[PDB]
Amino acid sequence: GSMSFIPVAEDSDFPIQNLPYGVFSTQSNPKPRIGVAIGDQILDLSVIKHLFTGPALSKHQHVFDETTLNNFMGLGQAAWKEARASLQNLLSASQARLRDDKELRQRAFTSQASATMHLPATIGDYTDFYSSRQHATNVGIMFRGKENALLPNWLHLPVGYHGRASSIVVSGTPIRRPMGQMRPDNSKPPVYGACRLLDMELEMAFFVGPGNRFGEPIPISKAHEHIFGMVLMNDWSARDIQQWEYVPLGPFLGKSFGTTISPWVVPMDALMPFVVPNPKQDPKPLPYLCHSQPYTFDINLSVSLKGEGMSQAATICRSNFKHMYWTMLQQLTHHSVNGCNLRPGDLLASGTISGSDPESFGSMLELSWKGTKAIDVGQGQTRTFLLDGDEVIITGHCQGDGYRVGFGQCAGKVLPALS
């Protein structure tokens, strides 16, 4: 194990083994600033930036002064590793530098309870992949049937689409049920009204570090050098609006009304201890998508739902990121194979995370099986899709011996449509 001079509860999401990056502000200071979570506190990086005396950061301390993590993300792995090593030393229970500097320590730390979290970065482009095999299979069965579940290209490339960047909001942001066009009756023209099949989608997403030049693909051998860290994501969906609009150009308004992400970006370095061998792929992908480097992660995911009249939230999904068929390396490589330029701060999501066990399906569309099964949310109460006032909270964590690497919350409450 390892210990910080800052007290850390055994089940805390933020032990010294984690050290996630976030943007926060406080009642005392409205300026959004970069911080690192440790225990129940936040270490203000702008206050201690002068302590980053290493080669990679000494002339780049200004990145810790920014209102977003973009510049830090754009520095690259040498900088990330140096920052992490510095923080591990400084927060160490045996290191005196910060521990014994009473005045520095006083203005460098703030309680997480006092902080308002903001989006970690300015996202230039958001991309949603569709890499969970059971998810695509489930949707396939409902749409086409048991026999033609997966479409021809699924096993050959990590299919994905460009999402809406503007509507990616931080955990805690209320999400209003969307108005739009839908076609409930095929024998009648479409109608305008409030979404009737509001859903959540359990996902995880990673931020891009240094980008690639316009026109220059990122070789899969170098893909890992561009992955900064991860966050939890709830890709809120309006299924009825989506179904009517999506053919042939893809998900659009049924997705863009809101997408929530957790605030704390857990660095890839903190997740490496939980890496496991990649799933066997058959057919074997083309050479450009082939890599031996293990890059599949054992991250326990959970989703709870709490109706406005409920006192206790019901856990409706227990899944794991290790189910994913295509890795983040294959996704990033594929995303740049044509020359597309990924940039620092870009966000690439996994797609709904569903395992084979029905208990691990990552969307109410799957859990209620298209509204044909009731989801048990605690006696006297059931659900098919989201009701106004419902709060959905996604959490996740890696379990180590005597410690865990957690992500904090990815929450949102449904507000009534303007109807």
Annotated binding site for Ca(2+): 128, 201, 203, 235
Q: What does 201 interact with, of Ni ion, Ca ion, a copy of itself, none (CB < 5 to 8 A by kind)?
A: Ca ion
> What string marks each residue from 216 to 245 as x (binds a copy of itself by CB under 8 A) or -?
xx--------------------x--x--xx
- Find the shortest distance in angstroms from Cβ 192 to a copy of itself: 5
326-329 CB contacts, 8 Å cutoff, 24+ apart: 326/129, 326/131, 326/158, 327/278, 327/291, 327/295, 327/296, 328/206, 328/223, 328/227, 328/295, 329/220, 329/223, 329/224, 329/227, 329/291, 329/293, 329/295
Q: What does 199 interact with, of Ca ion, a copy of itself, Ni ion, none (CB < 5 to 8 A by kind)?
A: none
**Within 266-285, which residues bind a copy of itself (CB under 8 A)?**
283
Residue 253, interface with a copy of itself (CB under 8 A)? yes
Element (H, E) at 323: none
**Within 85-144, which residues bind a copy of itself (CB under 8 A)?**
124-125, 130
Asked if 18 contacts 229 with a C-beta cutoff of 8 angstroms, the reply is no
- Find the shortest distance in angstroms from Cβ 46 to a copy of itself: 24
- Find the shortest distance in angstroms from Cβ 351 to Ca ion: 5
- Find the shortest distance in angstroms from Cβ 145 to a copy of itself: 15
Give SS3 for 90: helix
Residue nearest to Ni ion (CB): 1
Residue 187, interface with a copy of itself (CB under 8 A)? no
C-alpha span between 415 and 403 (Å, rounded): 36
Residues that bind Ca ion (CB under 5 A): 128, 201, 235
Q: What does 235 interact with, of a copy of itself, Ca ion, Ni ion, none (CB < 5 to 8 A by kind)?
A: Ca ion
C-alpha span between 410 and 260 (Å, rounded): 7
Residue nearest to Ca ion (CB): 235
> Would you please indicate which residues are annotated as catalytic (active-site) residues?
135
Residue 1, interface with Ni ion (CB under 5 A)? yes
Angle at 50 between CA 15 and CA 33, to 5 degrees: 60
CA distances from residue 28 to 22, 67, 244 in whole angstroms, order as listed: 18, 16, 48
Among 22, 209, 258, 408, binds a copy of itself (CB under 8 A): 258
Instruction: Indicate the residue among 226 and 397 with the shorter CB distance to a copy of itself.
Output: 226
Please work out the total of residues on this chain that contact Ni ion, with binding judged by CB under 5 A.
1
Among 337, 371, 378, 388, binds a copy of itself (CB under 8 A): 337
* DSSP character string of 263-297: S-BEEHHHHGGGEEPPPP-SSPPPGGG---S--EE
C-alpha span between 369 and 79 (Å, rounded): 46
- Find the shortest distance in angstroms from Cβ 6 to Ni ion: 17
Residue 190, interface with a copy of itself (CB under 8 A)? yes
Residue 201, interface with a copy of itself (CB under 8 A)? no
C-alpha span between 63 and 45 (Å, rounded): 9
- Find the shortest distance in angstroms from Cβ 87 to a copy of itself: 31
Among 247, 309, 372, 401, binds a copy of itself (CB under 8 A): 247
Residue with token string 């370095």: 269
Helices then strands, counting H and E runs in the chain, come out as 10, 27
Q: How many CB atoms lie within 10 A of CB 77?
A: 18
What is the maximum span of the chain, computed from C-alpha positions, in angstroms? Answer: 75
* DSSP character string of 136-155: HHHHHHHHT-STT-S-TTTT
Q: What does 1 interact with, of a copy of itself, Ca ion, Ni ion, none (CB < 5 to 8 A by kind)?
A: Ni ion
Asked if 8 contacts 39 with a C-beta cutoff of 8 angstroms, the reply is yes
Q: Is 243 exposed, middle or buried (0-12, 13-18, 19+ CB in 10 A)?
A: middle
Please work out the total of residues on this chain that contact a copy of itself, with binding judged by CB under 8 A.
69
Residue list, annotated binding site for substrate:
130, 144, 242, 246, 352
Mark the segment that binds a copy of itself (CB under 8 A) among 29-37, 43-51, 190-198, 385-393.
Answer: 190-198
- Find the shortest distance in angstroms from Cβ 159 to a copy of itself: 6
Residue 273, interface with Ni ion (CB under 5 A)? no
Mark the segment that binds a copy of itself (CB under 8 A) among 271-279, 312-320, 342-350, 364-372.
Answer: 342-350
